[PDB]
Enzyme design. Structure first.
Site, mmCIF file in Angstrom:
data_model
loop_
_atom_site.group_PDB
_atom_site.id
_atom_site.type_symbol
_atom_site.label_atom_id
_atom_site.label_comp_id
_atom_site.label_asym_id
_atom_site.label_seq_id
_atom_site.Cartn_x
_atom_site.Cartn_y
_atom_site.Cartn_z
ATOM 1 N N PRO A 54 0.868 -1.233 0.000
ATOM 2 C CA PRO A 54 0.000 0.000 0.000
ATOM 3 C C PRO A 54 0.882 1.252 0.000
ATOM 4 C CG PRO A 54 -1.064 -1.578 1.350
ATOM 5 C CD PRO A 54 0.245 -2.209 0.887
ATOM 6 N N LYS A 111 -1.892 -5.772 5.452
ATOM 7 C CA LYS A 111 -0.678 -6.078 4.657
ATOM 8 C C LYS A 111 0.552 -5.883 5.512
ATOM 9 C CE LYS A 111 -3.083 -5.221 0.425
ATOM 10 N NZ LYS A 111 -3.222 -6.392 -0.455
ATOM 11 N N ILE A 154 -3.668 -2.747 -3.387
ATOM 12 C CA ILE A 154 -4.104 -3.838 -4.288
ATOM 13 C C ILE A 154 -5.151 -4.629 -3.515
ATOM 14 C CG2 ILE A 154 -3.468 -5.810 -5.622
ATOM 15 C CD1 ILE A 154 -0.573 -4.551 -5.654
ATOM 16 N N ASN A 197 -8.245 10.354 -1.373
ATOM 17 C CA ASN A 197 -8.680 9.597 -2.576
ATOM 18 C C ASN A 197 -8.176 8.156 -2.405
ATOM 19 O OD1 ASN A 197 -7.845 12.422 -4.592
ATOM 20 N ND2 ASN A 197 -9.891 11.734 -4.050
#
Lengths: 114, 114, 114
Positions: free
Chosen positions: A1, A32, A64, A97
């Protein structure tokens, strides 16, 4: 990330340990491993939020997967909490975002994650 | 909405009132209240356009809706016009990436816009 | 195409000619004319990769097409190679977000590419 924070808060107002705190909390939030978490803080920026220049932040979180309605609400509570506590930015002056990246669209180590 | 402008134009060449002008013109263009418009200008950048370090800009406009073929043409005329008039950047040395964000993928105020 | 590299490597460690090298190599790799290639390098950043502040890079490559699994693996080998050779950043401390932009969502020269 990958988490990016762009802010008008001055560099001297970013506390020691902040990049590690972001790394740690995002590893826990995303599930993660911290080895895969990248963080970037950009202080001293020329920006406005809603027509004014009180502390604010414009942010990105790329992952992801692990992106969705409920997950993103949880991320926003965590990240606005950190920005409020550590950088004294009001949560109502933060935009984040969120991007759900395809593995084939993330380059790393001379290849992609596909 | 969130508008970011990255440019090699120096800080001193950004006029006083530029962030306020972007805020007002984007509120009018997007139809969204100015309270929800965020603007960020990043001058003095190491960038090139077509291999040239003449004035250029690399920009982003994020909106939850109000993004599409005709609207983006109109935004491009507006924003290239402002960059030409205020920062003396030629329109053919501007890129603007437009993003139609899902409300669930925008964090704000400890939650999302969903 | 638009390539952005954000790094904690200092400005003095970015070699002369780097933006031109990126422009040229990306023109060849993407098949696009060099006139359409924009590059942006942001050194001296406050960032971490895996909790570490060793040299790292967080990058973006935008293109209207020429984005996909095999192409992105090829871009990553190219771009990680350049960042290793020129900025001494380990390929395993580079992330590149790839974006396939719709022509209607790229503004240029007072309009879009649609």
């Amino acid at each position: 990330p990958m988490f990016i924070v762009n802010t008008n808060v001055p560099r001297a107002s970013v506390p020691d340990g902040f990049l590690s705190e972001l790394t740690q909390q995002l590893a826990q939030a995303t599930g993660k491993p911290p080895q895969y978490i990248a963080v970037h803080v950009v202080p001293d920026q020329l920006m406005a939020f809603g027509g004014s220049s009180e502390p604010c932040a414009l942010c990105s979180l790329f992952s992801i997967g692990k992106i969705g309605g409920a997950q993103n609400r949880s991320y926003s509570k965590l990240l606005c909490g950190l920005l409020a506590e550590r950088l004294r930015i009001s949560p109502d002056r933060v935009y984040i975002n969120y991007y759900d990246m395809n593995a084939a669209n993330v380059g790393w180590n001379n290849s992609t994650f596909a």
